[PDB]
Amino acid sequence: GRVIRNQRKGRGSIFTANTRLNKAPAKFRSLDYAERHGYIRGVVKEIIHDPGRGAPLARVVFNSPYKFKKQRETFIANEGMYTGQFIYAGKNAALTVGNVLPLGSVPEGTVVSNVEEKVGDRGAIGRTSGNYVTVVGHNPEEGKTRIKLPSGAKKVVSSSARGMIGIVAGGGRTDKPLLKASRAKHKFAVKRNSWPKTRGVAMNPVDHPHGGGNHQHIGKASTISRYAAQGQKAGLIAARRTGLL
């Protein structure tokens, strides 16, 4: 046969992300002396919409402690933030919504967002609309914190990893039906070229593992081994189980 559709996606050139309207990426400011021992204060100048994301962004302005300049930086806004709010980031920052604190200085049971797996990786976990990370417990003997991820998985990260108190803004987005092929089309038009999807079972054998036959059907099981050879993975890859839950 020929190269199937999911194989062509890795080359790009029509499958790359559309990012003309996307300005500077959403991430914390680089860890520095001010945040490691103390705190620094910033002002939420304005809350903006970032195409293809679904959660609003907030541009916060800080003061450079060395150069007499204002460092612009785009965070991910939480439910409650507003323009003119003062944002405090550091070890000694107060525990309020929108403040950026190390996870080791935050009590168990809290709710944080934009958690970083590694110290300095400026934001990795809990960044979509209604998602958040819960601090399960501490372990100060070696400086490690046990968190719970939006997927329901527990994980242990460094107690020096940062995070923003609260819940990401825009929650409940996926609770409204799109109702229209347009609404799906406009949703993906600013993200990438992945809509619509033709069904593989409706293709020809040259095009897909499912194609062909005098009836539209899958000849073999839709469950595909974990180590299939890059062109066989056209189903439920490495399914521990199938069927209705």
Next chain:
RNA sequence: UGAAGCCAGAGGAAACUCUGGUGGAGGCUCGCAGCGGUUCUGACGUGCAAAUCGAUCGUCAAAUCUGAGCAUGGGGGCGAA
């Protein structure tokens, strides 16, 4: 054609319910150009034309149409298939 929102009046004990306006929403509707190409299985079929012409027809505020610049190159691309 007439969705939210808004104005006035009426009925009821209340819950609330009616009437007349205003408003101008919708991958709404008739329909011209554009776009397409259902039927006549019409014309032509050494044609005007290596796919056109006539009537009839589908859509017509949008998943509509479109120019230029750019990208994807052959067991490769691209495909609402």
Next chain:
RNA sequence: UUAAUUGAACGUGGGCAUUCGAAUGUACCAACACUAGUGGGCCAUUUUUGGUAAGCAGAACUGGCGAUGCGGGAUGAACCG
């Protein structure tokens, strides 16, 4: 080989002559080398198998057409001369 110079096989020396042991013909002496084309066949008298039968399918002997004209069967690849 035999009981055996008894046999078996092959011979020397003699005898039988061209009537040398039926007819007819010899208008086919024998051997060798190298090589071509061919390796779809078909028809008929007689015999004969399968089949209801076939201008059907398959065999035996012989003769023909293929490769072949000529006179006859008006006409015809095979019939008659």
Next chain:
RNA sequence: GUCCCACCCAUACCCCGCCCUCAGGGUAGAAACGAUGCCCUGAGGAGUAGGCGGCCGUGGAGGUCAGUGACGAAGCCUAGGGCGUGAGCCCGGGUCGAACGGCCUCUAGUGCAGAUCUUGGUGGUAGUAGCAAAUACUUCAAUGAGAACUUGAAGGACCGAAGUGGGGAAAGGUUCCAUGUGAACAGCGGUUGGACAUGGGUUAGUCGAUCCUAAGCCAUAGGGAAGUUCCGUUUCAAAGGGGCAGUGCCCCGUGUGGCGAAAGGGAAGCCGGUUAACAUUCCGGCACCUGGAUGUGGGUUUUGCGCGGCAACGCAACUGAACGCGGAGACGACGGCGGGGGCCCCGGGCAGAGUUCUCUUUUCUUCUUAACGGUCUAUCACCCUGAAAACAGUUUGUCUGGAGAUAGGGUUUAAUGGCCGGAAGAGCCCGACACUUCUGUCGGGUCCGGUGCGCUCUCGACGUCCCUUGAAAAUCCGCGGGAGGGAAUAAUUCUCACGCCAGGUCGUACUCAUAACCGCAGCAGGUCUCCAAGGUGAACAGCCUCUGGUUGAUAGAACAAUGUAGAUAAGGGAAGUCGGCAAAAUAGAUCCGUAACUUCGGGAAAAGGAUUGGCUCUAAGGGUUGGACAACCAACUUAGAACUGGUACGGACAGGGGGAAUCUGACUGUCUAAUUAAAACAUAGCAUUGCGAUGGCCAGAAAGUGGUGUUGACGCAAUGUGAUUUCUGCCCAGUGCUCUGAAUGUCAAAGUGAAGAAAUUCAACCAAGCGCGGGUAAACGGCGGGAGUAACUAUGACUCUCUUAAGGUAGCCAAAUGCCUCGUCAUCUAAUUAGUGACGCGCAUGAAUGGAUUAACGAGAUUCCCACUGUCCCUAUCUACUAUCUAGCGAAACCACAGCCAAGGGAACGGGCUUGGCAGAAUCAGCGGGGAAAGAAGACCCUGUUGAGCUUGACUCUAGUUUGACAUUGUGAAAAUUUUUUUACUUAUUCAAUUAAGCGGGGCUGGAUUUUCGUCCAACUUCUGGUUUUAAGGUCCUUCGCGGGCCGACCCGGGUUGAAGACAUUGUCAGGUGGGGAGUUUGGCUGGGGCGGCACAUCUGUUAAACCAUAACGCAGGUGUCCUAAGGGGGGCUCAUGGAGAACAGAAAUCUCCAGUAGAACAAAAGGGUAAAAGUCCCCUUGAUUUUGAUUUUCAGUGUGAAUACAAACCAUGAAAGUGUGGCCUAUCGAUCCUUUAGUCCCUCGAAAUUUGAGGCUAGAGGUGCCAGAAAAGUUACCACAGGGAUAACUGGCUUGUGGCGGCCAAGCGUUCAUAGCGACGUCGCUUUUUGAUCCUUCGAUGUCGGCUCUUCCUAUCAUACCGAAGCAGAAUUCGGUAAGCGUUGGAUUGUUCACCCACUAAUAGGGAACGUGAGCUGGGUUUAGACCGUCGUGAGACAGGUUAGUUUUACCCUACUGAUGACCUCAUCGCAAUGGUAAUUGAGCUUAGUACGAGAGGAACCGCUCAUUCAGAUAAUUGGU
């Protein structure tokens, strides 16, 4: 039928002549000869494939002819001649002008009729097809040889502003303009031209490019790659940019390139005039921007950098360094509203033109004001006073207001607004005179209002939509900051006015299309955009007109058929047809009325009605200024009423047919460009799967490489189903996926141990995988039989049994899924294989391979009803353009030669042959029977040791991935020098962050800590949308300076900071996985192939026709084994059976006698053979051994298998003769290579020797059953090539089982009676309208069903004519004879042939003509490609299973036919008639007659009239149509 005479003629026979071939003789003291000759004799003569011999011809080479030739070589033409059997040679005549030939050898690119041969040229067709879309031209004159398509004037028309107009972008390139023109081109002409020839033509500081960046591309640093080069665009880089006087000295630095838009961003030009061709470009006037210099005036300043206002802010200036902050550039779509420019519209006035029988103070035209410099206003908004409920202000739209509204007073962004300048001096319009041209002069004027849901552009404030929020950069400006500098006698802002200089380079013409672009072209196609008048009208709808532009497309004459386009038709109204295909009908606006169903939104324009013109009126709906008023303006909309008319009025144009249902998809949307627009795809909704970044999915040869990702589970990635409602059942055995392994199995390389001299071997251990075990079906998928049973019968709630992983649950159904099947019942109709509603043991329905139901929607499929109609009964008529004739111009396909038939034979359907019929020049218009007409080396089928696409558990591999080992790979500790395990370290390696900014240790400050002095933690910043920078100061020096050092700001270590860490990673091997990918294969025979079978290696009998040989998918069978005896020898005996007899005992037990030719046995099929044996029992043995030869059968006299007779050993047996080299004989089986064994006291390892190891020679075994021996799965309905009529599917040909039809006999039936009418059991035929059988023709194609239309033929006669017979009284009916003259229907269902009904009828007979008839139609079916379902398959896919959508080409050629002319015999009129054609048909009323006949019922016919059905010819008084 037979007999007898004579005669005719074949290439045969006889004689003779001649040619050639073959054979046999003669020919030298040569007077003797192309001796390769001559003379004599005899016989013979066909020929494809093929073989051989001799000769002829062509281009060249050597020799020779003392060769020919300008007094004419070669070539060419020549119904002139000679020679040869022939290929050929020679000569004469004509043309021509320079070379050529014979003979002997040598040599070769050496001989053409074909190859759908190649190249070039030329025909018939043929003066033929044709030059027919876009409404259309006519008169006069000039030019000219010539005028329909040149020009001027006049008339008539068209485009009708989304144009046939005026400009451009792309593209083209001189097509632009003038002058001239022979040919060619402009498919007719041409004086004309986008043609040809010669010249000319494009002027920019202001337009565009140039500048910026976007998507993206390419350098640099680096890293890969054998390399061409790939990645990389800010990285793991010592990257750059400015100041002061070719160098010196300073300051900053986070970061350091280019290309990429003539539509994006952007400094700045307008008006008038001017050329044959340019204009925002030239000329005149009047401006603007940028850059650089620099003067005057003005402004500021003698305590140095302006004043005014409460404020919003203002003014002509009014310092401002580094650094920083902000704005502009800079942004979506849509809606109504308001302002402005332009256009349109309505008045009045000044001028001009048109009309003027009459009328119209009338109809039409001009009445203009640019950039730029000011000045005065224009929405929002903001400021001051003040403080609101009785809430107020306020928009078309409901927003604002104690966060300050109303009100009053102000500030300000915004001009395409008014006024002034520009500027009337311009332009324009009139009138009067100049003039030879130069085109000259003069005068007057160039005005004032209104209206609007008007159109277009633009601006502004609001509003709506988004899980959609709708570019960036160059560049410019403002502010914060306060560096430096700056006068009191002159400096200074050169953000004020004026003054000075300069603005480089390239493009610039023209078309922008029914003739300048692309399509082979001057092609009805395609190609981006701006401006957009009047009327009607809702309207850039259609129709007509103005400005502007065309009048270009071969023309003239007639008006035949058939056409194409436009139409109309009486009565009926789908009866036509597969089907209402096509057409008709409805249609605007206002008022009324509107159902089921429903997701409550719709359906809905449901359905269905009424009105509509003109004229005269009336009323309502406003604005402005002055206090329920008065006066002056305004243009549209609505409503009411009289009158009126041939009751007509959306009068043209424009403009929905509707309803009741079924199947299917929810809807909007999309695709097979050029046969399928769909039920297919998509979609929202639902569900499942993977993944927490050292990750998931994917790319790359590799990479310090990349996409998702400027991403982080409400995300990305992979799938299935397909809105809503209601549900989504059971099964984990099979195949997949997944999880754990404690586990015992299998188990690679490396490593370990043992043996050995070593190579090497062996053993243990042994990762992943497999195996084992669990889960998983919204994973792939699957979801049963048999029997009995209820008080009529029937059925089976119930029971029994086999069996599965589970046995189909809820639902649904002859459904797009049901064969039987046209299922059964009901409804629909007169009639229904159609539709609908039910039923259900459902071949083969069924639940996200989704089940059921669904409102709305559908160029989807289907049925019915109403309306409507030429679909039809049944045709007719009209118009335009063709066809037709003419002038001009002028092809192509096709073509062996050609063109009359009947029959015969023939390769089985002839134009040619044979026998007949016949047959008379040359033609024109039609036509579609034939030329098995043309188009294409059949696309169906088969063959090929020909492919390709796709699939998979085919064979062989492979990228990738997983696991193990070794290297990278280092340093310690702990237990059990080194083993395995754990643990620790950083420097290798890896990852991340950052402008490498603050790390580790200590000190200082504080508190609880034991207060051990000596322990742990902190150490500036948290009511607010402000600011933070170019250090203040302390101390020491100093030129006494915002000068210099240290501190301010603790010391030390130079590890930038974290994570991971000898594990990842990387390199090399090894095991697994791996249709993701690659290569290849997928036997043969065969009454076509596939399925079936094995007739593929072999044996017996028969076919087989008396030696042997001999075929078929002929007949009846067999083999792939079995046996230490069932082999070998010897001896004794006789078997199967029958009779008779003996206790249990009998039909069968064992014993005895007699008879018993084999009727038994001999392993196994059958056939031979055998009796003191070849059978049976007993005794002894291994001849079933060794050595090679000869022979036989199949046969090539090869192999294999098998067999025969000897010879030489060693044996066995017997007293011996003898016999024994497997089985009584005919079947019982296997090469090369490789491996292994036995033997060879053997040979070799090639520098020498020994021992292992290896290789040799002779003989076996391991096996090829496709058996003389390849290692091998499918599908193609997406398909391809070489071929085949060696071979199927359709016609024809032979045959006739089968189908159909007809005879003979006579058992019976018929009241009795074989034969009125039938006729069983038998039996003989005929036809080719059924289907078979066969495979002769056609595979470089004969268009393959039916229907429609039309002609003709047959008889085996349904009706009609005339007759015979009857179980014929009449009537009706049945059988038969002549006879094919003449008829044999309209419909429902089905594509149907057929069938089955309704109805009429004299009757509703059967057939043929290539299953008549596709250059006659249609395309319903069949019969490609799309799609759905059921069953089957793991899958790709298959299905004479069911559905839906799917391009039907060419006549002008010859003949045939239909008509029409026509030469010759002088012209003409009037006639004859050979021959050819021939045409009529049937029924009903009255009378006969209620009569004959007959017991009633019933019930005729002949004659004679009167009409009507079908058919035929003609006609236009009447009616109807046109």
